[PDB]
Amino acid sequence: ATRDQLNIIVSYPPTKQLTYEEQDLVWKFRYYLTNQEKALTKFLKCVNWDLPQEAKQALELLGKWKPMDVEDSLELLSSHYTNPTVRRYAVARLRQADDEDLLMYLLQLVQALKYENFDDIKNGLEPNLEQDLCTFLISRACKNSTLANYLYWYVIVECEDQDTQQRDPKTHEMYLNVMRRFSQALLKGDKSVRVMRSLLAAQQTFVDRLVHLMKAVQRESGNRKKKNERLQALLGDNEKMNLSDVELIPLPLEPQVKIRGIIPETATLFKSALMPAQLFFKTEDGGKYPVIFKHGDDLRQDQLILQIISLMDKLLRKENLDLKLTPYKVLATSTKHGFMQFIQSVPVAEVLDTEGSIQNFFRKYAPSENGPNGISAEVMDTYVKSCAGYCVITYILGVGDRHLDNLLLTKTGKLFHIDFGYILGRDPKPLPPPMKLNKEMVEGMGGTQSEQYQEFRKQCYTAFLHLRRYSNLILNLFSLMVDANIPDIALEPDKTVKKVQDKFRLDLSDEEAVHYMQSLIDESVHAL
Ligand SMILES: [Cl-]
Ligand SMILES: [Cl-]
Ligand SMILES: [Cl-]
Ligand SMILES: [Cl-]
Ligand SMILES: [K+]
Ligand SMILES: [K+]
Ligand SMILES: [K+]
Numbered sequence: 001a002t003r004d005q006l007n008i009i010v011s012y013p014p015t016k017q018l019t020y021e022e023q024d025l026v027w028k029f030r031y032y033l034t035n036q037e038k039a040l041t042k043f044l045k046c047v048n049w050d051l052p053q054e055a056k057q058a059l060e061l062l063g064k065w066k067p068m069d070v071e072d073s074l075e076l077l078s079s080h081y082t083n084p085t086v087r088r089y090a091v092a093r094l095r096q097a098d099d100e101d102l103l104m105y106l107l108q109l110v111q112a113l114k115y116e117n118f119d120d121i122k123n124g125l126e127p128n129l130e131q132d133l134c135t136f137l138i139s140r141a142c143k144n145s146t147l148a149n150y151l152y153w154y155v156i157v158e159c160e161d162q163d164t165q166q167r168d169p170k171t172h173e174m175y176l177n178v179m180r181r182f183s184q185a186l187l188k189g190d191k192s193v194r195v196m197r198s199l200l201a202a203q204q205t206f207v208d209r210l211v212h213l214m215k216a217v218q219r220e221s222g223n224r225k226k227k228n229e230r231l232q233a234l235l236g237d238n239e240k241m242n243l244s245d246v247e248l249i250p251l252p253l254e255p256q257v258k259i260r261g262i263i264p265e266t267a268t269l270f271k272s273a274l275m276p277a278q279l280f281f282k283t284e285d286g287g288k289y290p291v292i293f294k295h296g297d298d299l300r301q302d303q304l305i306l307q308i309i310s311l312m313d314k315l316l317r318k319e320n321l322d323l324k325l326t327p328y329k330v331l332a333t334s335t336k337h338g339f340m341q342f343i344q345s346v347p348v349a350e351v352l353d354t355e356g357s358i359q360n361f362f363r364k365y366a367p368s369e370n371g372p373n374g375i376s377a378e379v380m381d382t383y384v385k386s387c388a389g390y391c392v393i394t395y396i397l398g399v400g401d402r403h404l405d406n407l408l409l410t411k412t413g414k415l416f417h418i419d420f421g422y423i424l425g426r427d428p429k430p431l432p433p434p435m436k437l438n439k440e441m442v443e444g445m446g447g448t449q450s451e452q453y454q455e456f457r458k459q460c461y462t463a464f465l466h467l468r469r470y471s472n473l474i475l476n477l478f479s480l481m482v483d484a485n486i487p488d489i490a491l492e493p494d495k496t497v498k499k500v501q502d503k504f505r506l507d508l509s510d511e512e513a514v515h516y517m518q519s520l521i522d523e524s525v526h527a528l
Contacts, residue, residue: 002029010039013475013506014075015497018045030061037066041075049083059085070097071473074105077112077133078479084117088129091136099144104311106147107304108480109137110154118174124181134178138185142193148186149255150331152200155179157300157332163485202249207333209243214277214295214337217269224275228268231277236264248284253291253331253339258284278342290342299330299338301486305397305420306330308477312393312467319466323389323459324382326408326416335485345416348440349404358383358409358444365411373446382413384445384452387437388459390417394436395520396467396474396503400427402436415441423488424499435524448525457521461514468513471504 006029009022018026023046026033033039040062047058062085075081076090094102094109102109113121113133121134131139141148158164158175165172186197217230238245244261251257260282269275276294283289310327329341348358355361359373362383366376373380394402400422408416417436422428445452467474478500482493489496508516 006033006039010036010042012042013501013504014041014072014472015475015479015501018042022046034061034064035066037068038072040065040068041072044076044081044086055083062086062089068093070094070101071470071476074108074473074476074480077109077115078476079115079483081115085129087116088132091131091133092129094136095131099140099147102140103147103150104307104314105477106137106150107154107307108477109133110151110158111484112480113174113178114171114483116174118170118177121174121181122177125177126184134181138182141182142185142189142196145196145199145250146255148196148200149203149250149252151182152203153252153331153333155182156204157335161335161485199250202246203252206243206246206249207252207337209241210293211295211334211337213241213243214293218275224269224271227275231267231269232264235262235267251281251289251291252333253329253341254289257281257289259289260284263288292340292342293337294340295337297337298335298487299332299340300335300484301423301488302340302420303330303332303338304481304484304486305399305423308397308474309393311477312396312470312474313389315470315473316389316463316466321462321466323385323463324414325386325389325393326410326414328416328418343408343410343416345408345410345414347405348407348409348415351409352404352440358440359446361409362413362444366413372452376413379411379413380445380452383415384456385459386413386415387441387445388456388463390415391435391437391521392460392463392467392517395434396500397423398425398499398503399423399436400425400432402438404438404440407438407441415444424492424496426488426491433524433527435520437521437524437528439528442525442528457518460521461517464517465510465513468504468506468510471501471506475501 005025009018009026010033012018026042026046030043033043043061044058047054049055049058070093073090073093076086081087116133120132124135137151141151155175155178159172159179161172183197186193213231213234216234217227222230234241235244244264246259246261248258248260251259263280263282266280267277269277270292274294274296276292279291279293281289281291306327306329309325313325313327316323326343328343330338332338351358351361355364359375362375362379363373366379367374368376371377371380394417399417399420401419402417406417406419408418442448442453445456447453475497478497481489482496505513505516
């Protein structure tokens with residue numbers, strides 16, 4: 001009875017509002033819940049922090065409480081929590097995460113600095129619970145150069161944000177101070193952390209030079225061939241432009257990769273409105289890392305989606321489920337330019353135009369006499385899995401504007417999506433289908449009577465059930481994004497988390513969730 005009503009409350013997603021009745025029920029049993037880590041955030045929610053005596057008692061219980069997971073602590077950094085001791089406790093729990101996990105949350109943690117104390121951040125500038133979020137991140141960045149790289153670029157983009165600057169100067173000034181504190185901590189560090197500062201400086205001037213080059217190509221008119229030759233000439237002039245021969249600097253898009261420079265003679269522009277450049281970076285070890293450099297575009301919505309897809313890919317792998325996804329790197333180097341990792345691939349629309357069908361494509365580049373449908377069993381297994389993975393992930397994220405030009409394919413059988421300009425349920429058309437599945441994908445795996453389609457359906461159920469188990473973490477991260485300058489979030493900041501929460505159907509048992517996902521696929525198929 002009373003015990004059952006608590007377990008329902010405790011198991012709520014982190015963003016659901018407890019009723020008055022629910023809050024006072026949680027309070028009454030506060031002492032009966034101290035060994036349930038998943039109930040601590042529910043308790044903290046129901047505390048009148050206004051009242052000193054109750055706040056005292058609440059902090060006592062926070063001390064005696066079974067410590068909460070790192071994933072749940074992310075909730076305490078959101079805008080709904082202002083008590084300093086609660087926010088310092090969140091940081092203390094975050095300290096238990098290793099750097100691989102921390103890096104996967106970094107984009108959101110940088111947004112959460114909006115919810116920190118701005119005076120503390122400023123006051124740390126030279127003219128257990130002892131660390132706020134800013135001090136924590138700078139401290140972790142000074143020990144890991146990959147963390148430092150992303151901290152720098154994440155904060156630098158929030159600094160240049162002209163909407164924030166005009167519309168919320170206090171928050172813009174905080175991010176300047178965050179960057180000033182970072183620089184200060186780097187200069188006070190040992191030779192290791194001190195050289196990191198100049199590596200960051202070298203990356204920044206390289207991007208400025210690249211930005212300047214893109215503009216130079218576009219100064220006068222010319223056709224694409226003429227513009228490529230301008231691009232190539234300017235890149236090869238290293239005295240002038242200095243982009244083809246640099247001292248092994250980290251690549252911002254992926255700082256583990258050290259770059260000697262851009263290869264001048266293989267750089268070209270894409271045929272599109274913004275004419276982003278395809279650029280091959282020379283690696284310290286003689287290899288090539290292809291990127292797209294975009295100028296005149298805000299990559300931050302793409303950056304968020306690819307960060308989330310990367311996270312979901314890792315969660316699934318943690319569960320021994322590798323769906324062959326393609327979480328390509330995206331890094332905004334400004335609100336107006338950025339990098340994307342280039343993946344060798346071909347749009348499905350071009351597959352249909354040239355080979356007539358996904359199956360024909362596979363039979364041309366990966367045949368197998370005894371393989372399924374004459375296709376390499378290895379390639380077919382890669383295609384079924386990546387279809388299942390992307391069907392579930394784009395459903396959960398409500399990605400829209402899906403067509404055969406932003407569905408991409410590799411000769412190894414990987415299918416993946418690109419261009420996430422429409423998310424969280426926005427779409428150019430009204431009444432879009434909930435499962436982003438089409439007739440070309442289903443024919444690609446042999447149609448709906450095939451063993452592959454069965455496998456695809458099962459991989460969809462598995463993926464959905466696993467990601468459901470991580471709904472708290474995923475909902476928490478999204479709740480740190482509700483004030484970000486990301487267009488599809490800023491449209492309805494107060495409905496964003498709910499939009500993602502609903503997709504998990506946390507109201508269904510696992511048994512029921514699998515039936516639902518089965519009907520989602522069949523109904524989408526029946527409609528195709
Ligand atoms: Cl009520
Ligand atoms: Cl009181
Ligand atoms: Cl590590
Ligand atoms: Cl704080
Ligand atoms: K990352
Ligand atoms: K660095
Ligand atoms: K990849």
